[PDB]
Write an enzyme that holds these catalytic residues in place. Structure first.
Site, PDB file in Angstrom:
ATOM      1  N   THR A 137      27.430  53.356   9.576  1.00  8.25           N
ATOM      2  CA  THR A 137      28.298  52.187   8.821  1.00  8.25           C
ATOM      3  C   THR A 137      27.704  51.258   8.358  1.00  8.25           C
ATOM      4  O   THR A 137      26.724  50.615   9.403  1.00  8.25           O
ATOM      5  CB  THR A 137      29.615  51.868   9.573  1.00  8.25           C
ATOM      6  N   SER A 138      27.404  50.645   7.162  1.00  9.85           N
ATOM      7  CA  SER A 138      26.708  49.547   6.700  1.00  9.85           C
ATOM      8  C   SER A 138      27.572  49.026   5.394  1.00  9.85           C
ATOM      9  O   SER A 138      27.876  50.067   4.313  1.00  9.85           O
ATOM     10  CB  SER A 138      25.320  49.467   6.445  1.00  9.85           C
ATOM     11  N   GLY A 179      24.503  48.440  10.693  1.00  9.89           N
ATOM     12  CA  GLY A 179      23.532  48.416   9.619  1.00  9.89           C
ATOM     13  C   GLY A 179      22.855  47.135   9.540  1.00  9.89           C
ATOM     14  O   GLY A 179      21.998  46.699   8.596  1.00  9.89           O
ATOM     15  N   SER A 239      23.143  55.374  11.367  1.00 10.61           N
ATOM     16  CA  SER A 239      24.525  55.831  11.410  1.00 10.61           C
ATOM     17  C   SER A 239      25.449  55.594  10.051  1.00 10.61           C
ATOM     18  O   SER A 239      25.858  56.255   9.653  1.00 10.61           O
ATOM     19  CB  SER A 239      25.309  54.905  12.350  1.00 10.61           C
TER      20      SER A 239
END
Lengths: 242, 196, 108, 244, 249, 226, 242, 204
Positions: free
Chosen positions: B1-2, B130, B168
């Site tokens: 996730t970011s 992130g 991720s």
């Protein structure tokens, strides 16, 4: 007993007089509305009256925004108007939350309807004395008007009016769709439906109107707006130049 | 996730990366995290996919009902619906939610709301996993009221470092532009941002 | 679908002997059909025959034969329907004494 | 407000008496007759329908007769809506007894339980009674065949011959003269039929207007066959007794 | 506060319950509906009515669907019918499609709805719903069945019946018109003909609402490729199908 | 136990297999894991068997009640939402993994819901235990703009290769192809893997081989007549 | 009987109870609300019953939040319940949305509470009229709330005994200043028409209380006019009526 | 260790043609000790047969629970409760004791009497409609049973031959079990009549 219409109890005639008394109280603001289905819109016009110079004219209103797609036009006392405006808002949040699309007008007619029955079935709840006109534009049913009333009875409409002088309007609308021979005016833009609507109302009520004595609400596709007095002023000149 | 959001002259641009994992396996790599809960107030989901989603509905329920009784709510107001619900489910659930919106008065605003529930006004916000990699790049190179094209390439360069170093995150970089003009979608593919 | 287009076969048609003939063979066809919607259908074939004259005798014949089947294979409803039309053929040909006797007997 | 319009119908009269109970008893002689006659070998339950029309379907109707369990059936006379409720209360009670002791209920116990239910509605809560009268035919080993009537007050007494509903006084006089302590079931069937022929509230008395049911020891191995008859078996035993 | 928990239905001094005596009069102040039970099917037919002629009638339903085999039709009050149809469905799902995972038989559905009327007869803060319902449906084991549930909470099975204001005359007409075997094709012509003696109104498919619990329709199944189940045995008849039958009377 | 759903712009195919397991023992050789929420909304289930089946019942009821009050045809998104709330209040102790596939007055659809309350979008989803093996196949031979004839091969072969790369998979491939504007088509047993090998010896025994220590007769079929 | 309560209805559209609540408000003292350009200015006539009283030690203008002035007439104790309720409702909104409540929002809330008291057997509709306003960030607004649950926007409102004198003089003030007037200049105007509204009430003696909420004097808070500013207003009016 | 395996016991059910058969062992004790052989685990409600394994207490509580419902069904509907809706009934009562699970295994066996078609169905734990039309196995030695059944069975047998097959499928499995070995009952169930034959089976 001498109690027989203090509560919502049948009469020897088998009737609910109590509920009938609501319909004699839907005509106290003495405002009149007419609402017509275009081809790809819905238009609803209502009278505005202020009794004094000392009110603010903007806030005086009878056309209440419920969803962003469902307008609601109220005939009868403004205390019960508001209570009706609130309940409806509550169900509109409620439908989106649990079903994951915006409330259909059709479904708002039955919920608010069934709720009305529940007020005439408790022997301690007094029914709202408001006739609600629900205007919408649906994609699944097309442009529709649903009229609920203090009993909880409802039916669909091709056009409809409400108000104490509303018999007069019924003559105009009946004569009009008799000549067209269809339930909806073939007109592809909302502008000329505001122009038509005001014309039958001038004929019926017998009085011409001004910018500050009108209140107009328009349902288009996918948004519900109310026009201000300035946009209404433009419409009036263009009836004269037809 | 970011995810991130960063203000600019006429509003804000909101930015995210659309890879969504369960363990080692990506469930779907096209999964949007940019969520409309009001039509000028968007949000960016992170932490657990479940947890944020449930919160985004209940927050939608309370801004819909705001708009019908009291007019459209401000960005300040929507953040505070998020806050107080994150409060109740701090230990029960987790969320990272960055709340970003356009107001017609104070332009665009970015608030950030961790899992405990607190608000903090900021001109830029980063969250996810992130964001413990890209921290330094974002702060050296930032100046307020930068041109629109400079925002677009900054969020891009920022998120290209996030995808590069955190594994991720990934997928397409998507963005939502909140402006006076409207809501405009952007999308940049992997072959575009690796060069840029 | 077959009965409605068999209706064109019997009578439309232009005045012939075959038209004549065809109506007594319509009553034969009736008995094969033997169902509820046969009853309504029968009356209309008979009306088209009435409309165009083809043999005085023969008109009165087909109605009588149908009133016979209308109490033995079909129900009561058929019989009085056909009996009104028999009354009408009598009054128009100007047999008033026959038309009276027929009418009175019905009407209690 | 509310206290003003409160009926207060659950207070005593000056007589100490409960007006609504009497009003319930008044209205059940407006419903059809249901009779029980206890033979020594079985129990005949004979009910006369309170409706009849040639356009009625009265053939799937068991509108007076209900099985509470396979050993105790009832005859119902009164307002059918109130009655339906108690009927599924009773089923729930029978099955409860059966859950906990793994043994069928005796007739003594289930009649006391329904009666206490009624008692509650006339005793308090400002409600009106449940206006129903049940004739319980049942078999248990402990006291044998037992016949019972209960009324809307919620009081029970056992009987060797009883009548409820329409012409209660009348049916009682007749029963007393043509009863004998021990009968066969047939003789009982006959008597059941005969009383309803002299009390019928229309001159004619027919099978399609009879619901009729027995519980018979014509089941071997000391068991009881609950039989609710088909109206075409009623038609034959009515020609047997020579009524029709 | 509130203190309406005392019964508002009470026995009358003369006997009978006043409030249910009032409600039944009301059923004969309503619209007219009838049902004929055939060997191989069931028909219900009723009149559609509205305040003004400019109102729709396709957005209104007086034949309503409980289950795919069971429809209901009323005479009495519109508002009072609407709520009980919903409650009829709610109890049919919660107590029989969760516990047997299928739809209830007609007798079993009748009985459930008779309890709901019953607590509108008992207790405070209720007065009886002022409707009479027909519940015609089909189940497999007892075949075709026709019922009538009344204001009082009893039910009755019938072989043919009518309800509404034109009721006394209508059952007399149907007494001679009932037959021991009637086909569903024939019955359809019967119900129309009876309700034509009972309705003055302009007689089209658009004012006479026709519904049959005839026979199964595998095309209203909504899926294919399952031969094990079969479709709705109910089938609501729209204006076009009734128009052919208008002409065949 | 694998599920593929393949959205195309004509319809949707959702396919899954008939082997259910209870650990290493094969619990059932044919069982239909394709459930009908609605006629137009079929889903399949992977994960815990006793939790998929029972919650297609709950929502099946709740969606029919809903549609009857709305007097319009169901939305897919309506199914997805009902599920989402329901799962979430138990906090993931009902281990439902559904692929909710459906046509409606908005078009063809494919959604996923996972056993925590998480929901994902896509034109291809793969879910369940044998997922990994079906997923690998898909990405090589897919493209957008399939017909129902393209799609049906690709899905069913991913299910066939899932048998041969997973141990929970096995037995018959059922497929349901729900087009827009049509009745849903349950093409059950679209692909047979294998027919059970013919055994070389009859094993039906002589009569009177077993012994009977006692016996008795009871007929519960009737209660003692007159 | 059908003329006794609130849950009753009567075939004249009257619901006699609620109309009787206005008769309570009609025993009250004059209260005015002057809507100015910058805010709102309330004043209340406060009767001095006896020379035994401790003066300027009873406030009939009570604050709700920190920015909505509230002044009511009718039954004094009954009004204190309605204000307490709107202080709960303000506090609930302040928490849940972390801003000071808008005035059209405060309107919704109070409005609902009194409407409620006409639909149950066991309650009485409150007999008070409120006048409430302030500054929020959508600008200053003013509302008057009828015991019937009716309300409107207002450029000047009043209620009380001397609503007769006050109304005619408010017409005068919108025809003096039809482009509005300053909140500072309006202190002297509230003094002038409260004094004239004691010629329907000259059996006693009275004390004038004036409070304001204007953006430009008080930074948008509901404050009292006090000290030397307050006596300039008293003198101004006192000399006109002499 | 787990409750079900304390109390042991097995249930096998196999369709034939126009008929079915359900069978059990009658051991019922706790841990080591065999207490009783006077315990039947097949119960019936009309013409639906239900045998049930696992925890001894939840056996006897489902016997009472199901019974109570099939009374209410028989009185109301006025026909016996069919095996096919009994299957749904089993699923629903388990599944609402989702949390506080029952540690059971119902095996439903019956004949639809309106077509003559043989019907079996299974459950273990809190639901799981184990469809078959060949056989259903349950209990703590499902492994043993399962082997015997899959190899022996040839579809659409005669009732006499169905008896041979099921006698064997229990006998060999039971003494390669330590949680069985005391007694055995085989119900041969024709769609007109019910034969119970207790087998001879060597003591543990």
């Amino acid at each position: 007993a001498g109690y027989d219409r203090h509560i919502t109890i049948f009469s020897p005639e088998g009737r609910l007089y109590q509920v009938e008394y609501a319909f004699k109280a839907t005509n106290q603001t003495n405002i009149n509305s007419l609402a017509v289905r275009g081809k790809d819109c819905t238009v609803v016009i209502s009278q505005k009256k202020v009794p004094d110079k000392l009110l603010d004219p903007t806030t005086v209103s009878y056309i209440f925004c419920i969803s962003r797609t469902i307008g609601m036009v109220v005939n009868g006392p403004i205390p019960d108007a508001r209570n009706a405006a609130l309940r409806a808002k509550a169900e509109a949040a409620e439908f989106r939350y649990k079903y994951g699309y915006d409330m259909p007008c059709d479904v708002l007619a039955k919920r608010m309807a069934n709720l009305s029955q529940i007020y005439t079935q408790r022997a301690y709840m007094r029914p709202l004395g408001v006739i609600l006109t629900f205007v919408s534009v649906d994609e699944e049913l097309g442009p529709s008007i649903y009229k609920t009333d203090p009993a909880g009875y409802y039916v669909g409409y091709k056009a409809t009016a409400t108000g104490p002088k509303q018999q007069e309007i019924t003559t105009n609308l009946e004569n009009h769709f008799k000549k067209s021979k269809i339930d909806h005016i073939n007109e592809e833009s909302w502008e000329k439906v505001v122009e038509f609507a005001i014309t039958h109302m001038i004929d019926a009520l017998g009085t011409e109107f001004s910018k500050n004595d009108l209140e107009v609400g328009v349902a288009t596709k996918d948004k519900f707006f109310t026009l201000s007095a300035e946009n209404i002023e433009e419409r009036l000149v263009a009836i004269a130049e037809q | 996730t970011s995810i991130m959001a960063v203000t600019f002259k006429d509003g804000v641009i909101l930015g995210a990366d659309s890879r969504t994992t369960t363990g080692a396996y990506i469930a779907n790599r096209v999964t949007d995290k940019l969520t409309r809960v009001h039509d000028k107030i968007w949000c960016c989901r992170s932490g657990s996919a479940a947890d944020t989603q449930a919160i985004a509905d209940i927050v939608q329920y309370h801004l819909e009902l705001y708009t019908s009784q009291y007019g459209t709510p401000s960005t300040e107001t929507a953040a505070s619906v998020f806050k107080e619900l994150c409060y109740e489910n701090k230990d029960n659930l987790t969320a990272g939610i960055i709340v970003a919106g356009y107001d017609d008065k104070n332009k665009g605003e970015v608030y950030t709301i961790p899992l405990g529930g607190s608000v903090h006004k900021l001109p830029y916000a980063i969250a996810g996993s992130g964001s413990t990699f890209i921290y330094g790049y974002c702060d050296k190179n930032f100046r307020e009221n930068m041109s629109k094209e400079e925002t677009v390439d900054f969020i891009k360069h920022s998120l290209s470092q996030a995808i590069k170093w955190d594994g991720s995150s990934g997928g397409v970089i998507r963005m939502v532009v909140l402006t006076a003009a409207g809501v405009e979608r952007l999308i940049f593919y992997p072959d575009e941002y690796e060069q840029l | 679908t077959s009965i409605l287009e068999l209706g064109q076969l019997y009578v439309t048609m232009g005045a012939k002997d075959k038209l004549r003939e065809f109506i007594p063979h319509s009553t034969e066809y009736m008995m094969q059909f033997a169902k509820s919607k046969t009853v309504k259908v029968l009356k209309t074939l008979i009306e088209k025959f009435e409309q165009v004259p083809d043999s005085l005798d023969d008109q009165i014949f087909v109605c009588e034969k149908s009133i016979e089947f209308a109490k033995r294979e079909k129900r009561v409803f058929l019989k009085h329907s056909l009996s009104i039309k028999l009354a009408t053929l009598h009054y128009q040909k100007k047999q008033y004494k026959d038309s009276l006797a027929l009418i009175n007997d019905l009407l209690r | 407000g509310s206290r003003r319009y409160d009926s207060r119908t659950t207070i005593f009269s000056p007589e100490g008496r409960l007006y609504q109970v009497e009003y319930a008893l008044e209205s059940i002689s407006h419903a059809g007759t249901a009779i029980g006659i206890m033979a020594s070998d079985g129990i005949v339950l004979a009910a006369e329908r309170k409706v009849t029309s040639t356009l009625l379907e009265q053939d799937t109707s068991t509108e007076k007769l209900y099985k509470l369990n396979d050993k105790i059936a009832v005859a119902v006379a009164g307002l059918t809506a109130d009655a339906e409720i108690l009927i599924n209360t009773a089923r729930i009670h029978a099955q409860n007894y059966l859950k906990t002791y793994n043994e069928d209920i005796p007739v003594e116990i289930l009649v006391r339980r329904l009666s206490d239910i009624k008692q509650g509605y006339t005793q308090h809560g400002g409600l009106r009674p449940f206006g129903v009268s049940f004739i319980y035919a049942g078999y248990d080993d402990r006291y044998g065949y037992q016949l019972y009537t209960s009324n809307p007050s919620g009081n029970y007494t056992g009987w060797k011959a009883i009548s409820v509903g329409a012409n209660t006084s009348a049916a009682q006089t007749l029963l007393q003269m043509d009863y004998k302590d021990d009968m066969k079931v047939d003789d009982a069937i006959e008597l059941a039929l005969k009383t309803l022929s002299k009390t019928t509230d229309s001159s004619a008395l027919t099978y399609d207007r009879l619901e009729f049911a027995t519980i018979r020891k014509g089941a071997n191995d000391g068991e009881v066959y609950q039989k609710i008859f088909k109206p075409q078996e009623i038609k034959d035993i009515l020609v047997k007794t020579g009524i029709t | 506060t509130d203190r309406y928990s005392f019964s508002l239905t009470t026995f009358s001094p003369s006997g009978k319950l006043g409030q249910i005596d009032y409600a039944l009069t009301a059923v004969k102040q309503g619209v007219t509906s009838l049902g004929i039970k055939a060997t191989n099917g069931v028909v219900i037919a009723t009149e559609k009515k509205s305040s003004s002629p400019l109102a729709m009638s396709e957005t209104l339903s007086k034949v309503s669907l409980l289950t795919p085999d069971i429809g209901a039709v009323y005479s009495g009050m519109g508002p009072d019918y609407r709520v009980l149809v919903d409650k009829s469905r709610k109890v049919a799902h919660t107590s029989y499609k969760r516990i047997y995972g299928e739809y209830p038989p007609t007798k079993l559905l009748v009985s459930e709805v008779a309890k709901i009327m019953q607590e509108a007869t008992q207790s405070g803060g209720v007065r009886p719903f002022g409707v009479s319902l027909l519940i015609a449906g089909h189940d497999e084991f007892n075949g075709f069945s026709l019922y009538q549930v009344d204001p009082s909470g009893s039910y009755f099975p019938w072989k043919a019946t009518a309800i509404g204001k034109g009721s006394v005359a209508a059952k007399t007409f149907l007494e001679k018109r009932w037959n021991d075997e009637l086909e569903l094709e024939d019955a359809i012509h019967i119900a129309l003909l009876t309700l034509k003696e009972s309705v003055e109104g302009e007689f089209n498919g658009d004012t006479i609402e026709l519904a049959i619990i005839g026979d199964e329709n595998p095309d209203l199944l909504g899926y294919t490729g399952i031969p094990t189940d079969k479709g709705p045995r109910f089938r609501k008849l729209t204006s076009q199908e009734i128009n052919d039958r208008l002409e065949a009377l | 136990t694998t599920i593929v759903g393949v959205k195309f712009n004509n319809g949707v195919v959702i396919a899954a297999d008939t082997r259910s397991t209870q650990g290493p023992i094969v619990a059932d050789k044919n069982c239909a894991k394709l459930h009908r929420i609605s006629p137009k909304i079929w889903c399949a289930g992977a994960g815990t068997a006793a939790d998929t089946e029972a919650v297609t019942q709950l929502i099946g009821s709740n969606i029919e009640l809903h549609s009857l009050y709305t007097s319009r045809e169901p939305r897919v998104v309506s199914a997805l939402q009902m599920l989402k709330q329901h799962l979430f209040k138990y906090q993931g102790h009902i281990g439902a993994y559904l692929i909710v596939a459906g046509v409606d007055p908005t078009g063809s659809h494919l959604f996923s819901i996972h056993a925590h309350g998480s929901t994902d979008v896509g034109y291809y989803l793969s879910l369940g235990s044998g997922s990994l093996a079906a997923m690998a196949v898909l990405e090589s031979h897919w493209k957008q703009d399939l017909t129902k004839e393209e799609a049906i091969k690709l899905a069913s072969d991913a299910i066939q290769a899932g048998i041969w790369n997973d141990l929970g998979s096995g037995s018959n491939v059922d497929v349901c192809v729900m087009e827009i504007g049509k009745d849903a088509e349950y093409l059950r047993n679209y692909l047979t893997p294998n027919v059970r090998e013919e055994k070389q010896k009859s094993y039906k025994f002589p009569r009177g081989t077993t012994a009977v220590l006692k016996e008795s007769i009871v007929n519960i079929c009737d209660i003692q007549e007159e | 009987g059908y003329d006794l309560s609130n849950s009753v209805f009567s075939p004249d559209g009257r619901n006699f109870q609620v109309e009787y609540a206005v008769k309570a408000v009609e025993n009250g003292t004059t209260s005015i609300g002057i809507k100015c350009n910058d805010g709102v200015v309330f004043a209340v006539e406060k009767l001095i019953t006896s020379k035994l009283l401790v003066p300027q030690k009873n406030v009939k203008i009570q604050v709700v939040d920190r920015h909505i002035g509230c002044v009511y007439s009718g039954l004094i104790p009954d009004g204190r319940h309605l204000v307490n309720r709107g202080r709960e409702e303000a506090a609930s909104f302040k928490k849940l949305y972390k801003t000071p409540i808008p005035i059209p929002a405060f309107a919704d809330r109070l409005g609902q509470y009194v409407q409620a008291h006409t639909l149950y057997n066991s309650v009485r509709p409150f007999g008070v009229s409120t006048i409430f306003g302030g500054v929020d960030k959508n600008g200053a607004h003013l509302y008057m709330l009828e015991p019937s649950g009716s309300y409107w926007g207002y450029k000047g409102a009043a209620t009380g005994k001397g609503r007769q004198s006050a109304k005619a003089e408010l017409e005068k003030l919108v025809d003096h200043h039809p482009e509005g007037l300053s909140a500072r200049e309006a202190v002297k105007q509230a003094a002038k028409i409260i004094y004239l509204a004691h010629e329907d009430n000259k059996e006693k003696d009275f004390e004038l209380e004036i409070s304001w909420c204007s953006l430009s004097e008080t930074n948008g808070l509901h404050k009292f006019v006090k000290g030397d500013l307050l006596q300039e207003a008293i003198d101004f009016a006192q000399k006109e009526i002499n | 260790s787990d409750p079900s395996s304390i109390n042991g016991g097995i249930v096998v059910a196999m369709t034939g043609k126009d008929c079915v058969a359900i069978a059990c062992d009658l051991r019922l004790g706790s841990q080591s000790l065999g207490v009783s052989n006077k315990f039947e685990k097949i119960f019936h409600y009309g013409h639906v047969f239900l045998g049930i394994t696992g925890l001894a207490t939840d056996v006897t509580t489902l016997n009472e629970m199901f019974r109570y419902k099939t009374n209410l069904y028989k009185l109301k509907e006025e026909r016996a409760i069919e095996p096919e809706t009994f299957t749904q009934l089993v699923s629903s009562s388990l599944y609402e004791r989702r949390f506080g699970p029952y540690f059971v295994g119902p095996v439903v066996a019956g004949i639809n009497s309106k077509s003559g078609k043989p019907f079996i169905a299974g459950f273990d734990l809190i639901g799981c409609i184990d469809e078959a039309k060949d056989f259903i196995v349950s209990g703590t030695a499902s492994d043993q049973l399962f082997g015997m059944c899959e190899s022996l069975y040839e579809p659409n047998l005669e009732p006499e031959d169905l008896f041979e097959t099921i006698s064997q499928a229990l006998l060999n499995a039971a003494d390669r079990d330590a949680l069985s070995g005391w007694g055995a009952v085989v119900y041969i169930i024709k769609k007109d009549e019910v034969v119970k034959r207790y087998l001879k089976m060597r003591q543990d």
